[PDB]
Amino acid sequence: SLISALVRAHVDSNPAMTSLDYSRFQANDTQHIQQFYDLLTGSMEIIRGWAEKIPGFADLPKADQDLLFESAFLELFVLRLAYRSNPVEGKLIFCNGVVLHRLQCVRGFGEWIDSIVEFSSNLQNMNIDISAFSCIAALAMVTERHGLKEPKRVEELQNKIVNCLKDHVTFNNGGLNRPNYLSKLLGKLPELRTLCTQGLQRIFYLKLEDLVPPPAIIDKLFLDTLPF
Amino acid sequence: SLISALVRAHVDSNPAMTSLDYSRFQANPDYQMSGDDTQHIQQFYDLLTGSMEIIRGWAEKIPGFADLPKADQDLLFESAFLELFVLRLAYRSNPVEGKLIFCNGVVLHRLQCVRGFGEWIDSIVEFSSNLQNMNIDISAFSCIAALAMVTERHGLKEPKRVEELQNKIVNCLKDHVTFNNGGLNRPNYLSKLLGKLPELRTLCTQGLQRIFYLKLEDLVPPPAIIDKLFLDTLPF
Amino acid sequence: SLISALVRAHVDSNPAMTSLDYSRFQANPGDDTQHIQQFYDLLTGSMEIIRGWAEKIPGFADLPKADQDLLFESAFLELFVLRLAYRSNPVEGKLIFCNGVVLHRLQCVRGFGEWIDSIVEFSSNLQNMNIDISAFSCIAALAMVTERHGLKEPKRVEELQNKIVNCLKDHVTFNNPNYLSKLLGKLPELRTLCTQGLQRIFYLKLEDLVPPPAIIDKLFLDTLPF
Amino acid sequence: SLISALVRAHVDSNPAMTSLDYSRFQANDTQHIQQFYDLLTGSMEIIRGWAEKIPGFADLPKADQDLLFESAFLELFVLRLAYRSNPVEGKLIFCNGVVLHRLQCVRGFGEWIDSIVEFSSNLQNMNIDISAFSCIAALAMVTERHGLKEPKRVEELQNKIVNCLKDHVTFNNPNYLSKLLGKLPELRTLCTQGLQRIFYLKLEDLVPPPAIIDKLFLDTLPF
Amino acid sequence: RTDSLKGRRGRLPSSLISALVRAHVDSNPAMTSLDYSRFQANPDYQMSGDDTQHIQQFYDLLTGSMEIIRGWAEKIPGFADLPKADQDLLFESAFLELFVLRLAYRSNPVEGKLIFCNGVVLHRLQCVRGFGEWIDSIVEFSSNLQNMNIDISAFSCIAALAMVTERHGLKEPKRVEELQNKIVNCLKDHVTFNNGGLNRPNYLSKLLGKLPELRTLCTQGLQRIFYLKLEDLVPPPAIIDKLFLDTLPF
Amino acid sequence: SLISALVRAHVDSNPAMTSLDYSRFQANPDDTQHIQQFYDLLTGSMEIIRGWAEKIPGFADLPKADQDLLFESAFLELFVLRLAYRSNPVEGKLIFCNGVVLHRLQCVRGFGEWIDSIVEFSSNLQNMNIDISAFSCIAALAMVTERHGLKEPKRVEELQNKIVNCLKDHVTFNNGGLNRPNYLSKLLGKLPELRTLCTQGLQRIFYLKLEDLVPPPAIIDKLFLDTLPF
Ligand SMILES: [Br-]
Ligand SMILES: [Br-]
Ligand SMILES: [Br-]
Ligand SMILES: [Br-]
Ligand SMILES: [Br-]
Ligand SMILES: [Br-]
Ligand SMILES: [Br-]
Ligand SMILES: [Br-]
Ligand SMILES: [Br-]
Ligand SMILES: [Br-]
Ligand SMILES: [Br-]
Ligand SMILES: [Br-]
Ligand SMILES: [Br-]
Ligand SMILES: [Br-]
Ligand SMILES: [Br-]
Ligand SMILES: [Br-]
Ligand SMILES: [Br-]
Ligand SMILES: [Br-]
Ligand SMILES: [Br-]
Ligand SMILES: [K+]
Ligand SMILES: [K+]
Ligand SMILES: [K+]
Ligand SMILES: [K+]
Ligand SMILES: [K+]
Ligand SMILES: [K+]
Ligand SMILES: [K+]
Ligand SMILES: [K+]
């Protein structure tokens, strides 16, 4: 039930891997930077829709919803990108269907893009099925955050998702041949958070470069993702 | 890649368990023989025709299907429609509570479907009970649904093409199972999973007997679309 | 150097006798389900601790991560029993675990089964040999760094073993005769003791009162000699 | 008709208690363990023949026939042994007519033999007649197992034998039919200890079980 | 063993290979037609110096197997369909590895007996003069290969994979990858089926892992040929010169 | 070593699937002609199969008289076994020891309905998917077995047991062991089935002898009293 709801949410908020845009894809500045910004802001509405489809999420104080969302947006944008992309081939696929190459992105994302592809690769070598990934993505947002009004409520939804993930992995001796798979899975969240600090560094860099000022929406993003 | 498409196909053609319409749901046994069968037999025909566009939409979303000769696509879909309908129904319903949930979100009790479906509805609930006791995950179920249609059919223009698409799906299902077990396959589980198809085929012949019965009774004659359904499903 | 590192590995992976938890200790000469789950917990709770120990053995962390897992997985039960036997108090029937918990023999027999009696016996024999920390730290390392099938680098393994062997050899001489053979002779004795540990888990799986979790089932399969 | 065929199947597959083989008997190593292995392997064809004489068994899918036999063999071997032996005198009498004293079997069977003698004593203290026993033995095998091709066929045949035992009990008439069926679960538990013995012997590695015994092991495992 | 509780790991049991086996049997000396005429295991009877003799022998054993291994390669189903150019590239790129693999498989490491594609049986001590210290590594490899007890059907696939592998400068490398995959899936299905439907990923990783080890082992062969030419005592003839350049990974 | 020698004996005495002779194959419709061919296929395999027999380690160490007796007694069985293993039943393609390829339908006139029994056995055999090493042992076993009139029944029993041992080791370590519990048994079980199968071959030759349409050559007429269960 919950797992099915988590999977539908994922499916409904992701591009059909049979409806991808390769118009500007080529495995061969101010232009690539603004693009970096667009991609980020473009996924904001997509991921927000996804969050609203997480059972129990709409039952949290609206204030707690925006706090959870905003604090995890970047992590969510990167985890989703990492899961649907083809690391080996260096093909990046965004929440909107656009497909760029690891090299075309390096001009906008910076060397961070290389850190992302590496994460994408480690993530895929874990062979995470759609159900386990749908739980993990939800766990990246439904987690403890400073400033929460209903921290106990967040913790309850969190534990419900981990339990849902645990049953999926251990049902009928599903864990026998993958001992700490559940632990390795959860372990990807702190790695993801560490990974996203470089996204903040990049945004800071572009702001100090003052070659192309970040939009208020992203300037805002910088502050919401800021751990402190 | 292939399995994601298959899961997307399934998800997109099924109702979110939040769109579930529990309005026409009646569990009181007494309030059951109320209202002549006509209304119930019609409901039966409608539920079947109602899922046609839906399942055809799912079939069109199956990678490789459209590359098959247009006549084969039609022979495969028409021959498997009823089985798809029954399988999808059996996977999403709640057998323990005697609740049937259709390709459209309508929730009827077993006791209500008996008026239209006939005793066949009990064989269906039993099939649902066996299917759900296996705890098939969505990725696995989406492959099985696909394999109920992408399967051998006599009078197929390019049977070798279908066989290849079929192998591709089977192989996609084996990887899922094997990858979730640390790289070690599970041949018995797999055969138990694939064995549900012959069972589905057998279960549905009873659906053909219910339509034949309705045709003979001639009280609520099957409309042209159900007539076609009957002939497309006839194993001979 | 090697000996020092081996001792540090031991010390850092063991509880100080002044940080023990007696909250669950009861020697008066609970649900059966509770004792069995406790048995499973004491095993799973020691895994990370003992893994930490292994990773502190000079060279181990240099072997292919594949070989590491194979050596660790095949010796864990033995490492658990040996460390428990070395630190416990046979005479007083006090079993002391990797995590500091103290349990009386009588409390363990309901979870561990009669096998706890064989462990207390082994712990008694081990202690009568008055083995010092340096020597015990070498034996412990040898219990794991030993011949195993499936090792991507069998050479890289016998390399460590022998070094550790010589280390214990020089330590016995420098501090001094048929004593070195009595020490290594404890390893085959250890492995036999652990076959009884396998019987206990096999029994619990048959009784099906409380099936072993996946982690314990794998432990079961990994410890099987074949 | 059924009870008769069941009794006949039983008599034809058991040794004439007047022509027992004592050539290896003695009331005073690796050999006893080997003998433990042989007794088991020798009773296989004998019990297989018996199963083959159960009305309706041979009609089940071949796969199911092999599945039920392979899964209940150890229990059938033990049950049949407990029934024909003499617990009071500590004499174990096997399917093949061989007679050994408890003191000989403990060396091969292990302390499991004592549990077998205990079960034998409890069984015989119930004064179960040959007709009733012939039903219970059949129930030890024609029961539900995970993997049946036609689980219904099995349940079909099972109730039929159960009804067969029911009538025989009523005519001769109490909770007896209860204590009767109760022995099966007890027999099931008793044999797990048999699995423990075989497992211990495999670990010990002294005298390795032959391929056929390892097969029996994997075949009986309840998990 | 894959036959126990440990080996099953919680599970329960349920043409191309034949051609590959024939290719192998036809291209190998009957172990009953071996030539022991020059087999001298006596440390003392190591013919009076003359490094030249042994070095030329080294070159001859190599060239003497070329036509044989080329024949075998031509019996690999699907190989011919490949562009002649790729056939040549794959063959020349793998010849050395194929030569050592086959030698390692048929030889007797425990007795120090090296048995060549042509039937000649030489002792390890005789080969060290020609092959150099490299012969000891081959023997080690041989020893490790045989401890796996790989049956003829399995080895025939591995030998084929030593050649049907990606190489830089391929006309149709995709057609190559498809033959390679066909052969690997053939090996997997054969091992799985023969294990009662239960796959053996660890065994399979070990079998295929032997190829990287073989590639590495042969670089030492290149080092020997490089040495012999640097030493210029018995320069490498034109055919060995080509062998060297064909095997160069760069 | 023995098993490896058994495999070479098999490979050397069998036709490469790329060197087959279809100059007579058809697979579709189109007499004293079919019967003569039936006799030729049998006599032609004789030399081939005898060549294989001599390649079996230890077989040449038996008294020549025991060699002839063992060979002669198993000829038909070997002919059928080898035919069933290499042929392709699904497509009804019979491939003989000599490379000649005929369709099932082309054989029914000379072989009789027995050809249908062979194709079935071929079908059952192939479903077992016996690998070459195991098959090479079973073929050897069909011949190295007990027969009445052996001069050295103990020597034969010894070569036989060495072969089954060779087979048991290969099956346990390469054919799944207990993961295929009844394989070794089903495999040896094919020998008695093979023998029964060939009795129909004797009946065929009997029939042809009674019809006297074309008298069997001494070789085969011999094969008759050389295969006869007595
Ligand atoms: Br849902
Ligand atoms: Br894992
Ligand atoms: Br998709
Ligand atoms: Br899934
Ligand atoms: Br699978
Ligand atoms: Br009767
Ligand atoms: Br009697
Ligand atoms: Br086992
Ligand atoms: Br298990
Ligand atoms: Br061939
Ligand atoms: Br050449
Ligand atoms: Br191996
Ligand atoms: Br494996
Ligand atoms: Br594999
Ligand atoms: Br292995
Ligand atoms: Br040979
Ligand atoms: Br083969
Ligand atoms: Br003799
Ligand atoms: Br089998
Ligand atoms: K993993
Ligand atoms: K209805
Ligand atoms: K499989
Ligand atoms: K299963
Ligand atoms: K009676
Ligand atoms: K072989
Ligand atoms: K495999
Ligand atoms: K078979």
Q: Nearest chain B residue to E2 by CA: give it.
A: B184
Lookup: tokens for A184: 């390795």
Q: What is the spatial distance between Cα A49 and Cα A192, in angstroms, rounded to a whole number?
A: 21
Cβ-Cβ contacts under 8 Å, A173 against chain E: 10
**Which residues, listed in sequence order, are joined to residue C102 by a DSSP beta bridge?**
C96
The owner of tokens 């091709």 is D149
Length of chain E equals: 250
Strand, coil or helix: what is E113?
Answer: strand
Q: How far is the CA of B178 from the centre of ligand 20 (A)?
A: 13
- Give B84: exposed, middle or buried? Use CB within 10 Å, 0-12, 13-18, 19+: buried
Min Cα separation C203/chain D (Å)? 7
Q: How many CB atoms lie within 10 A of CB B122?
A: 15
Alpha helices in chain C, H assignment, sequence order = 2-12, 32-55, 65-87, 105-108, 115-128, 133-144, 154-174, 180-184, 186-207, 214-223
Q: What is the spatial distance between Cα B184 and Cα F96, in angstroms, rounded to a whole number?
A: 41
Question: Which one-letter DSSP state was computed for residue A91?
Answer: E
8 Å CB contact between C182 and C129: yes
- Give E116: exposed, middle or buried? Use CB within 10 Å, 0-12, 13-18, 19+: buried
Residues after which a C–N gap over 2.5 Å breaks chain A: 28
Min Cα separation A171/chain E (Å)? 13
- The amino acid occupying position C214 is A
Ligand nearest to the CA of E202: 13
8 Å CB contact between D86 and D93: yes
Residues of B with CB under 8 A from a CB of A: 1, 3-5, 7-8, 11-12, 16-18, 63, 135, 137-139, 176, 179-184
CA neighbor of E129 nearest in space, from E62, E61, E50: E50
CA neighbor of A6 nearest in space, from A40, A42, A56: A56
- Give F161: exposed, middle or buried? Use CB within 10 Å, 0-12, 13-18, 19+: exposed
Lookup: tokens for C175: 């501090």
8 Å CB contact between B32 and B111: yes
Q: What is the spatial distance between Cα F170 and Cα F173, in angstroms, rounded to a whole number?
A: 5
Q: What is the spatial distance between Cα F119 and Cα F127, in angstroms, rounded to a whole number?
A: 12
Residues of A with CB under 8 A from a CB of B: 1, 4-5, 7-8, 11-12, 16-18, 127, 129-131, 168, 171-172, 174, 176-178
Min Cα separation A31/chain E (Å)? 37
Q: What is the spatial distance between Cα A193 and Cα A196, in angstroms, rounded to a whole number?
A: 5
Q: Nearest chain C residue to E4 by CA: give it.
A: C226
Ligand nearest to the CA of D63: 19
- Give D116: exposed, middle or buried? Use CB within 10 Å, 0-12, 13-18, 19+: buried
Residues with Cβ within 8 Å of E72's Cβ and at least 6 positions away in sequence, in order, are E23, E24, E26, E27, E159
Cβ-Cβ contacts under 8 Å, C202 against chain D: 195-196, 199
Residues after which a C–N gap over 2.5 Å breaks chain F: 30
Instruction: Flag if D203 and C225 touch (Cβ within 8 Å).
Output: yes
CA neighbor of C82 nearest in space, from C220, C201, C193, C2: C193
Q: What is the spatial distance between Cα A102 and Cα A92, in angstroms, rounded to a whole number?
A: 7
CA neighbor of C126 nearest in space, from C50, C200, C187: C187
Q: What is the spatial distance between Cα E228 and Cα E62, in angstroms, rounded to a whole number?
A: 14
Q: What is the spatial distance between Cα E56 and Cα E237, in angstroms, rounded to a whole number?
A: 9
Cβ-Cβ contacts under 8 Å, B137 against chain A: 129, 131, 168
Q: What is the spatial distance between Cα A115 and Cα E69, in angstroms, rounded to a whole number?
A: 47
End-to-end CA distance of chain A: 36
Q: What is the spatial distance between Cα E161 and Cα E98, in angstroms, rounded to a whole number?
A: 10
8 Å CB contact between F155 and F21: no
Cβ-Cβ contacts under 8 Å, A170 against chain C: 214
* Domains of chain D in sequence order: 1-223 (1.10.565.10)
Q: Nearest chain F residue to E108 by CA: give it.
A: F1
Mutation target to probe the C interface, by most C beta carbons within 10 A, among E5, E11, E147, E148 is E5
Length of chain F equals: 230
Residues after which a C–N gap over 2.5 Å breaks chain D: 28, 173
Lookup: tokens for B112: 């209500």
Lookup: tokens for F195: 């023998």
Q: Structure solved using which method?
A: X-ray
CA neighbor of B194 nearest in space, from B141, B139, B119, B117: B141
Min Cα separation E241/chain F (Å)? 36
Cβ-Cβ contacts under 8 Å, A177 against chain E: 9-10
CA neighbor of E188 nearest in space, from E172, E173, E208: E208
Residues with Cβ within 8 Å of B104's Cβ and at least 6 positions away in sequence, in order, are B15, B21, B47, B50, B51, B54
Checking phi first, is residue C63 left (phi over 0); if not, alpha (psi -120 to 50) or beta? Answer: beta
Q: Nearest chain F residue to D210 by CA: give it.
A: F178
List CB-based neighbours of ion ligand 25 within 5 Å. Answer: E 151-152; F 133
8 Å CB contact between D40 and D213: yes
Tally A–B CB contacts below 8 A.
52
Q: How many CB atoms lie within 10 A of CB A111?
A: 11
Instruction: Flag if B7 and A11 touch (Cβ within 8 Å).
Output: yes
Question: Which one-letter DSSP state was computed for residue B63?
Answer: T
8 Å CB contact between E225 and E240: yes
Strand, coil or helix: what is A95?
Answer: coil
Q: What is the spatial distance between Cα F144 and Cα F165, in angstroms, rounded to a whole number?
A: 13
Lookup: tokens for B40: 């119930």
Q: How far is the CA of C70 from the centre of ligand 2 (A)?
A: 14
Nearest neighbour of F179 by CB, restricted to E2, E25, E190: E2
8 Å CB contact between B186 and B176: no
Q: What is the spatial distance between Cα B176 and Cα B143, in angstroms, rounded to a whole number?
A: 10
Q: What is the spatial distance between Cα C171 and Cα C166, in angstroms, rounded to a whole number?
A: 8
Q: What is the spatial distance between Cα B174 and Cα B183, in angstroms, rounded to a whole number?
A: 10
Cβ-Cβ contacts under 8 Å, A166 against chain C: none
Mutation target to probe the A interface, by most A beta carbons within 10 A, among B88, B136, B138 is B138
Residues with Cβ within 8 Å of D150's Cβ and at least 6 positions away in sequence, in order, are D60, D61, D64
Q: What is the spatial distance between Cα D177 and Cα A68, in angstroms, rounded to a whole number?
A: 65
Q: What is the spatial distance between Cα D103 and Cα D91, in angstroms, rounded to a whole number?
A: 9
Min Cα separation D204/chain C (Å)? 8
Lookup: tokens for A9: 């949410």
Cβ-Cβ contacts under 8 Å, D200 against chain C: 199
CB burial string E46-60: b at 16+ within 10 A, e below: eeeeeeeebbebbbb
Nearest neighbour of E1 by CB, restricted to C217, C222, C226: C226
The owner of tokens 């036709």 is F15
Nearest neighbour of E31 by CB, restricted to F4, F12, F133: F4
Instruction: Flag if D196 and C199 touch (Cβ within 8 Å).
Output: yes
Instruction: Flag if A174 and B184 touch (Cβ within 8 Å).
Output: no
Residues after which a C–N gap over 2.5 Å breaks chain C: 29, 176
Residue E191 CA to its chain's centroid (Å): 21
Instruction: Flag if C215 and A175 touch (Cβ within 8 Å).
Output: yes
Q: What is the spatial distance between Cα C187 and Cα C183, in angstroms, rounded to a whole number?
A: 8
The enclosing H or E element of A71 equals helix A62-84
Tally B–E CB contacts below 8 A.
26
Radius of gyration of chain D, Cα coordinates, nearest whole angstrom: 17
The enclosing H or E element of F227 equals helix F218-227
Lookup: tokens for B162: 């279908």
Q: What is the spatial distance between Cα D209 and Cα D220, in angstroms, rounded to a whole number?
A: 15
Residues with Cβ within 8 Å of B209's Cβ and at least 6 positions away in sequence, in order, are B120
Residue A224 CA to its chain's centroid (Å): 15
Instruction: Flag if F177 and D215 touch (Cβ within 8 Å).
Output: no
The owner of tokens 């999403």 is B92
Min Cα separation F180/chain D (Å)? 10
CA neighbor of F133 nearest in space, from F187, F196, F54, F74: F187
Cα angle for residues C36, C68, C100 (degrees, 5° grid) = 40
The enclosing H or E element of A218 equals helix A216-225
8 Å CB contact between B113 and B121: yes
DSSP H helix total and E strand total for chain A: 9, 2
The enclosing H or E element of A93 equals strand A91-93
DSSP E151-185: -HHHHHHHHHHTTSS--TT-SSHHHHHHHHHHHHH
8 Å CB contact between A133 and A54: no
Instruction: Flag if B178 and E199 touch (Cβ within 8 Å).
Output: yes
Alpha helices in chain E, H assignment, sequence order = 5-8, 16-26, 51-74, 84-106, 124-130, 134-146, 152-161, 173-193, 201-231, 238-247
Residues with Cβ within 8 Å of B44's Cβ and at least 6 positions away in sequence, in order, are B113, B116, B117
Lookup: tokens for F26: 């058809």
Residues with Cβ within 8 Å of D61's Cβ and at least 6 positions away in sequence, in order, are D149, D150, D153
Checking phi first, is residue E49 left (phi over 0); if not, alpha (psi -120 to 50) or beta? Answer: left
Tally A–C CB contacts below 8 A.
16
Mutation target to probe the F interface, by most F beta carbons within 10 A, among D44, D215, D220 is D215
The enclosing H or E element of F197 equals helix F190-211
Q: How many CB atoms lie within 10 A of CB C34?
A: 12
Tally C–E CB contacts below 8 A.
14
Taking each helix axis as running N to C, give the angle between helix F190-211 and helix F114-127, from 0 to 180 degrees, rounded to the nearest 10. 160
Residues of E with CB under 8 A from a CB of F: 1-4, 8, 13, 15, 18-19, 21-22, 25-26, 30-32, 149, 151-153, 190, 193-198
User: What are the C-alpha distances in Å from F91 to residues D136, E77, F11, F17?
Assistant: 51, 21, 23, 15
User: What are the C-alpha distances in Å from A153 to residues A71, B45, F4?
Assistant: 17, 47, 70
Residues with Cβ within 8 Å of E174's Cβ and at least 6 positions away in sequence, in order, are none
Lookup: tokens for D87: 């617990």
8 Å CB contact between F48 and F54: no
Q: What is the spatial distance between Cα F217 and Cα A198, in angstroms, rounded to a whole number?
A: 91
Q: What is the spatial distance between Cα C106 and Cα C120, in angstroms, rounded to a whole number?
A: 11
Q: What is the spatial distance between Cα A84 and Cα A82, in angstroms, rounded to a whole number?
A: 6
List CB-based neighbours of ion ligand 1 within 5 Å. Answer: A 4-5, 8; B 16-17
Lookup: tokens for A23: 């118009």
- The amino acid occupying position D122 is N
Instruction: Flag if D196 and C207 touch (Cβ within 8 Å).
Output: no
The enclosing H or E element of E13 equals none
Min Cα separation B228/chain A (Å)? 33
Residues of F with CB under 8 A from a CB of E: 1, 4-5, 7-8, 11-12, 16-18, 129, 131-133, 170, 172-181
Q: Nearest chain C residue to A174 by CA: give it.
A: C214
Cα angle for residues F29, F32, F37 (degrees, 5° grid) = 75
Q: How far is the CA of B61 from the centre of ligand 3 (A)?
A: 9
